Amino acid sequence: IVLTQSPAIMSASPGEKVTLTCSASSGIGFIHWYQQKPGTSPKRWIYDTSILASGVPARFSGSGSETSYSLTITIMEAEDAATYYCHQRSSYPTFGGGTKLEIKRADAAPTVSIFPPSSEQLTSGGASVVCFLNNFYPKDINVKWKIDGSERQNGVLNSWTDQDSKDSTYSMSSTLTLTKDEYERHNSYTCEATHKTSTSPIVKSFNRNE
Amino acid sequence: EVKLVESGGVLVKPGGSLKLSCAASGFTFRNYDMSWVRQTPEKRLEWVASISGGYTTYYPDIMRGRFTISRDNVRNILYLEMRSLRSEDTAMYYCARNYGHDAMDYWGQGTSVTVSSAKTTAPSVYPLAPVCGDTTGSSVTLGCLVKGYFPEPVTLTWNSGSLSSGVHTFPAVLQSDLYTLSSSVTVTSSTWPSQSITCNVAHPASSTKVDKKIEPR
Numbered sequence: 001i002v003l004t005q006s007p008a009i010m011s012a013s014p015g016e017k018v019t020l021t022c023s024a025s026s027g028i029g030f031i032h033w034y035q036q037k038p039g040t041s042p043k044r045w046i047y048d049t050s051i052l053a054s055g056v057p058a059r060f061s062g063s064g065s066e067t068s069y070s071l072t073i074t075i076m077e078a079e080d081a082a083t084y085y086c087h088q089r090s091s092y093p094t095f096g097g098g099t100k101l102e103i104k105r106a107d108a109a110p111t112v113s114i115f116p117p118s119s120e121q122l123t124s125g126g127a128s129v130v131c132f133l134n135n136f137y138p139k140d141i142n143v144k145w146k147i148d149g150s151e152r153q154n155g156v157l158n159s160w161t162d163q164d165s166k167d168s169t170y171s172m173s174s175t176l177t178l179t180k181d182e183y184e185r186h187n188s189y190t191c192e193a194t195h196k197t198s199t200s201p202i203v204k205s206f207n208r209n210e
Numbered sequence: 211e212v213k214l215v216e217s218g219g220v221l222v223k224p225g226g227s228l229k230l231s232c233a234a235s236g237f238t239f240r241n242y243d244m245s246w247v248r249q250t251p252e253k254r255l256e257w258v259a260s261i262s263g264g265y266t267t268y269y270p271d272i273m274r275g276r277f278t279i280s281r282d283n284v285r286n287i288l289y290l291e292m293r294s295l296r297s298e299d300t301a302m303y304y305c306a307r308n309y310g311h312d313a314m315d316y317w318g319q320g321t322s323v324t325v326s327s328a329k330t331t332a333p334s335v336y337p338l339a340p341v342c343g344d345t346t347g348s349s350v351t352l353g354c355l356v357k358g359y360f361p362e363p364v365t366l367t368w369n370s371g372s373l374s375s376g377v378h379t380f381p382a383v384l385q386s387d388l389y390t391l392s393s394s395v396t397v398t399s400s401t402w403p404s405q406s407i408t409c410n411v412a413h414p415a416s417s418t419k420v421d422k423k424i425e426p427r
């Protein structure tokens with residue numbers, strides 16, 4: 001019994017209605033919903049299709065029958081942003097891939113920051129130049145590097161954070177990983193941060209030392 | 211105070227075995243059916259096994275042969291014996307309880323299993339300071355990068371708990387059997403360069419715990 005949760009990731013502003021949906025391969029007596037937030041176990045949330053777990057706000061409801069089910073937050077709250085797995089145990093236990101609820105914010109551009117290798121890293125014989133594109137929204141960003149003006153996109157370790165609890169913005173960490181031999185063969189090292197907020201990028205560079 | 215507490219998640223090579231102990235408290239264990247459910251690094255939940263109050267085991271076909279669900283009803287403990295591991299068997303392993311017809315009502319916080327041919331390599335520590343007298347205006351950001359460690363995970367801090375707002379600590383990415391992990395922090399241009407800052411980082415396996423204050427220029 002494959003359970004199917006479309007969409008896998010969505011967004012809503014506090015106050016809006018949110019309806020997640022779960023569709024069973026084949027008919028089942030009951031669906032059960034688990035809320036998981038990052039760095040915890042899933043908590044049981046709505047069970048036996050309808051029945052709210054103790055603790056769970058009245059804004060949450062669970063409807064459905066046979067083969068289609070839906071969980072509905074009546075009045076979205078920042079509080080409710082988590083991944084919501086659906087689950088059946090009528091035939092062999094299974095889960096959905098879960099839809100992920102993120103909090104819709106106003107658009108923000110990022111506080112970009114480029115940093116040339118530490119002395120102990122340059123010592124070891126390998127350069128890694130870090131760009132912290134911090135506190136933007138939407139999630140959706142692409143960064144491109146230019147090793148002496150020419151677009152070089154190899155050795156690039158990108159890593160995002162889960163949406164912020166306070167500001168509900170995303171943040172990213174780009175790491176261009178060269179060698180010392182390679183780092184001692186160029187001058188300019190720039191950091192092109194392209195985002196929805198402006199047509200004009202937000203650059204931050206350093207021509208090696210001084 | 212219904213408590214479930216998983217144990218003995220580690221690194222072991224493809225083909226080796228491992229025993230997970232889940233320890234129950236705050237409810238009559240023997241009245242509840244217990245289950246293992248694992249979450250893959252990409253957050254897909256997968257039922258592994260379930261054992262009856264009456265010691266009846268249930269398994270899906272992919273899990274039968276290599277997994278043995280079992281319980282101690284007297285010292286209330288649940289056990290998963292995993293044998294001959296694949297890279298697929300890398301996940302969080304949560305124990306959880308259901309009563310009867312009912313669905314799982316409470317999950318432990320899970321023990322972490324990673325199975326790969328990579329070796330306990332310690333992390334390396336380098337800070338990141340940009341300012342030599344420029345963008346010394348509104349605020350400044352400091353950085354703390356850790357490169358090439360195994361296994362995951364690693365835990366950090368800024369001045370042993372100080373900074374809550376402004377801290378960003380990014381999820382480890384794998385290059386090739388080597389994990390690298392960055393973290394940042396923003397401050398008023400008043401507090402830096404004055405209050406010198408040090409990110410404490412500790413690796414579980416190697417037990418390595420080198421500190422590194424952020425340098426001036």
Ligand SMILES: CC(=O)N[C@H]1[C@@H](Oc2ccc([N+](=O)[O-])cc2)O[C@H](CO)[C@H](O)[C@@H]1O
Nearest residue numbers: 089090091092093243244245260261268310
């Ligand atoms: C996780 C969970 O929900 N686990 C429980 C669920 O497991 C089942 C349910 C159905 C099948 N099946 O159709 O082959 C196999 C195992 O029900 C069992 C009987 O109620 C046990 O209580 C078990 O602890």
